[PDB]
A = this chain, B = another copy of it.
Amino acid sequence: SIRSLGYMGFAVSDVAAWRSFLTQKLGLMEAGTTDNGDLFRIDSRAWRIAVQQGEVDDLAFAGYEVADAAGLAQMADKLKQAGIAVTTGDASLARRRGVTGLITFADPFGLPLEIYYGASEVFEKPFLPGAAVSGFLTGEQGLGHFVRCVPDSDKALAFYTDVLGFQLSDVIDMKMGPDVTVPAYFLHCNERHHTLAIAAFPLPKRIHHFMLEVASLDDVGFAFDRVDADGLITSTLGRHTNDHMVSFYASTPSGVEVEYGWSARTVDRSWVVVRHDSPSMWGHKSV
């Protein structure tokens, strides 16, 4: 079974702007440049985010991690049985991603996805943030989460749950307008409240935002100010109703947003699905 979101790749028009944004604003660590693009780290892994030159300015691919070769084989079989076109990653791609083995395919609406096992650790190159950040929260919870924008949430939900195995945490009926309410589905694959969210938002991108979690409230507070200095804040500090994360949102150079948060609650086998009519307990004012 999928254990977590392991990495993400972005294809952007301004690579230098993304490099500055990720390191100086968010605190990620520059981890070199390879055929996989410019690499960035947040922990012991060789890389978590890759930035490649591309006019799409959006998420180019996402990789989900399984525990071992057997787990990869099981997921491959499930995808094929579901009628999805699955391709074994060649040696060239595996080396590019720094993984031992992987398979590639696309979700119902075209997002290129990868499931891999045996990623590269680089403990001998100790993590050093590009900005003052006490640390990022990963471990068994993976990289963080992203919100997939789709035209048919029922179809997307069925794929991610029935085929990929994600489990529903809760639903938030997002008020878009007096006569517009759209359900946002939050799904987990480990203890992180959600690793993936699905919603039918009117955005011209594959995702609304990706999220990175830090270890202290100060990490979030300082980052907010670094981002605010350039007028990139899109939402003030607030705490979510479902995962109880304290965070803020900001614009990346591609328009797609990034959420930066701290202190979210986790889920367990005793969790029960619920619904909400608001995404925030307090704060998160649109600015």
Interface residues of chain A, those whose CB is within 8 Å of chain B, are 3, 65-69, 98-100, 117-124, 126-129, 131-132, 140, 168, 170-171, 217-218, 221-222, 224-225, 228, 236-239, 241-242, 244, 246, 270-278, 280-283, 285
Contact = CB atoms under 8 A, between A and B. Distances in A.
Contact of A275 (B120, B124, B127, B270): B120
A131 B128 contact: yes
Contacts of A280: 124
A145 B124 CA distance: 23
A67 B268 CA distance: 12
B282 A222 contact: yes
B118 A274 contact: yes
Contacts of A276: 120-123
A221 B241 contact: no
Contacts of A69: 273
A237 B239 contact: no
A277 B128 CA distance: 19
A241 B121 contact: yes
A34 to B, nearest CB: 13
A124 B224 contact: no
A123 B224 contact: no
Contact of A271 (B67, B117, B237): B67
Contacts of A271: 67
A65 B274 CA distance: 10
Contacts of A277: 120, 122
A132 to B, nearest CB: 4
Contact of A127 (B67, B121, B128, B132): B132
